[PDB]
Amino acid sequence: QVQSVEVMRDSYGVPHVFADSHYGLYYGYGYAVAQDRLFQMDMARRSFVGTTAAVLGPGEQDAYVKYDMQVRQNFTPASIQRQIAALSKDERDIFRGYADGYNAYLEQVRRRPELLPKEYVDFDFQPEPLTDFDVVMIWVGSMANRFSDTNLEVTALAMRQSLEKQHGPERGRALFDELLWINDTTAPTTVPAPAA
């Protein structure tokens, strides 16, 4: 298995990758991302894996170390580990090619210090290579871990409890149904045509 990938830049600087395999298509893709957003992606990955405090912090008031643990609560590393491994070679190549491609340019900045982003010197730390685990983590961390893990159940219950001690338990839940409603008014708007 030997091939070639070409990364093309348009008038606005967006890459167009041409390859014959899954590995190559994301090797070039991961490669171009390292050129445009080396520090952002490093800090994105560290945010969703929970290694922010490792480079900066803690603080001001132990905020970094307080999130690194907090993110560890919201993801079980063993579950994702076996999930990735079960994938077929072709499906595994998307994450491997991406990680290997991102590191391809990342080892140029280790050899050519002139290509190092200003952020690394100002923050006084080194760029770290990316793994296929880290690639998946960026999604489930800012994809289904930000827009799909959203929950306000505990604070909704704490509302009932506070109301039930000042108005409850007869009129404590009646005001609770007005503030938070199980089902919406039926008057609201829906994107899917409601029998109309």
């Binding site: 093309m8 167009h16 991302v33 945010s47 079980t76 219950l157 007005e178 829906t190 994107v191």
Partner: protein, 551 residues
């Protein structure tokens, strides 16, 4: 996040238009990365957040797709009694069950490593411990164990050529997410795929279920429970963070009412019979500035003004407000109109004697916030309507249609009695500090901002590296448009500021660092090359890489 897609029935130039506006908030460098993947079966073009392997917003000359937030309850929390003796042992069924434990190592720069322990029950990880109440709250996800399956299923919409293949890939999705469909033939669709749990009828969706094993899910709903809207009689589909389907309930986190921001986009379809692609692209400008909650209080404020004695009832305020459109036009910093200042302060006075006494003080702020943007930070992104504005709106419905079992927030008062007082209180509030001259009523205009860090608080760049607007626009973090014509397809986006967050160590920036900030401000589009001939012809810089993928 706002998407609106139309079909040739409604557009003059007979084309399937699909405009999507993802709302994540505005950050520097760009939240989004634009790419084209061509080869190995893949032929896609567009942009995606966090430079995902998946292209979230793109077209492939066969199907244009988009995405907004998923409004479905896939996460239930369970409360369990902890043994007063052994705090590390909960209760499932039918006796005390030992809690699982995994310990984690956190590296800290300059300081020694800190060690934590994460608790997990039969349901999931324990998010909160309450020792004195003797209860721990655990988090159960419906999509747990189906993360990578969701990535690939989302990723393979690129391969999809028709509508029926799109659901074949949407079915595999376990997370809650709104998917939108458009193709070259004039067909538009909408899917909201999620692993929906069959939950017991005893469960109150607002609050946690019981962890004593009495209240447990019965499994996963069949795929017919997922909201599916394909080709509608109206000739358009439009979503702005609202209900997924008529026959749907409110998520523990998402509560809607008849006052919804999507009315600011829908209303424009009812304006004309047939519009051009430029006009549908111009639907955004009328939505970026228009006030979200003004549409619903206007008839209440108008009804008062006309029925009021024009003799001396302070009608001078009501006559300067009703002519005002939701738009927030400003002037070199200061707002041109007194109306938005008075509407803001009126809403706060409506909270002061409406949702102040009834709502507990702890989360009182959750209900008594106004919502819309001010020059002073911070700005989330989507204005929308606060919980207090919503409770006030459906209480008006409750007064109009009394339910004897149900309790009203107005109570001993009419809706207009409080409104009248709140308007006078707002006038007295502006008259007390403000110049006190309706002819000078001004609040400083909202300023659009690009954070030097992601939503988590983690810095993407050196502190201070930010961008500002005039100028605030309530739109997407990025704006893409897809047009289909007998000729072909056209991808039209303009993700600001640029596609390069690279700063040369000296200090100079990449030429494409902000080459997309002036056109986003002006609602202009940048053309993305889609057909190979265009990519071949229009590419300025080409670099070739030689590799061999071996174990």
């Amino acid at each position: 996040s706002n998407l609106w897609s139309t079909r040739p029935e409604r557009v003059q130039e007979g084309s399937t238009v699909l405009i999507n506006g993802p709302q994540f908030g505005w950050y520097n460098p760009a939240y989004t990365y634009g790419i084209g993947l061509h080869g190995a079966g893949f032929d896609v073009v567009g942009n995606t957040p966090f430079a995902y392997p998946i292209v979230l917003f793109g077209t492939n000359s066969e199907i244009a797709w988009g995405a907004t937030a998923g409004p479905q309850d896939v996460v239930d929390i369970y409360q369990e009694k902890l043994n007063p003796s052994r705090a590390d042992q909960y209760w499932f069924n039918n006796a005390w069950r030992t809690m699982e434990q995994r310990k984690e190592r956190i590296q800290v720069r300059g300081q020694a490593d800190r060690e934590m322990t994460i608790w997990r029950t039969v349901h999931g990880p324990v998010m909160q411990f309450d020792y004195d109440q003797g209860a721990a709250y655990s988090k159960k996800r419906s999509w747990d164990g189906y993360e990578v399956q969701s990535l690939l299923a989302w990723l393979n919409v690129a391969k999809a050529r028709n509508w029926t293949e799109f659901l074949d890939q949407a079915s595999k999705m376990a997370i809650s997410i709104n998917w939108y469909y458009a193709d070259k033939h004039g067909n538009i669709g909408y899917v909201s795929p999620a692993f929906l749990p069959q939950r017991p009828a005893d469960q109150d969706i607002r609050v946690p279920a019981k962890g004593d094993g009495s209240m447990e899910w019965l499994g996963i709903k069949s795929f017919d429970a997922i909201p599916k809207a394909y080709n509608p009689p109206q000739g358009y589909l439009v979503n702005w963070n609202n209900k997924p389907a008529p026959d749907k309930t409110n998520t523990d986190t998402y509560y809607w009412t008849y006052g919804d921001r999507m009315n600011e986009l829908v209303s424009q379809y009812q304006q004309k019979d047939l519009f051009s692609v430029q006009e549908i692209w111009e639907f955004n400008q009328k939505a970026s500035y228009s006030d979200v909650n003004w549409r619903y209080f206007r008839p209440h404020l108008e009804k008062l003004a006309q029925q009021l004695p024009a003799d001396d009832s302070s009608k001078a305020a009501l006559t300067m407000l009703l002519a005002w459109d939701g738009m927030e036009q400003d002037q070199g910093g200061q707002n041109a109109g007194p109306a938005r200042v008075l509407f803001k302060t009126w809403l706060e006075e409506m909270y002061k004697q409406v949702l102040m006494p009834v709502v507990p003080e702890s989360h009182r702020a959750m209900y008594s916030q106004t919502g819309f943007a001010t020059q002073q930070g911070p700005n989330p992104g989507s204005i929308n309507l606060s919980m207090g504005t919503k409770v006030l709106l459906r209480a008006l419905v409750l007064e109009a249609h009394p339910d004897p079992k149900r309790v009203n927030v107005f109570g001993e008062r009419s809706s207009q009695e409080i409104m009248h007082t709140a308007l006078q209180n707002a006038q007295a509030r502006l008259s007390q500090e403000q110049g006190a001259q309706m002819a000078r009523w001004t609040m400083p205009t909202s300023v659009h901002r690009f954070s030097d860090k992601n939503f988590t608080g983690t810095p993407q760049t050196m502190p201070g590296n930010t961008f500002a607007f005039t100028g605030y626009q309530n739109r997407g973090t990025e704006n893409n448009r897809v047009v289909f014509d007998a000729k072909g397809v056209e991808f039209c986006d303009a993700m600001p500021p640029g596609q390069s967050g690279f700063t040369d160590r000296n200090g100079v920036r990449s030429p494409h660092y902000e080459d997309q900030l002036k056109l986003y401000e002006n609602f202009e589009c940048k053309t993305m090359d889609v057909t190979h001939a265009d990519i071949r012809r229009n590419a300025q810089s080409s670099t070739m890489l030689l590799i061999q993928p071996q174990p």
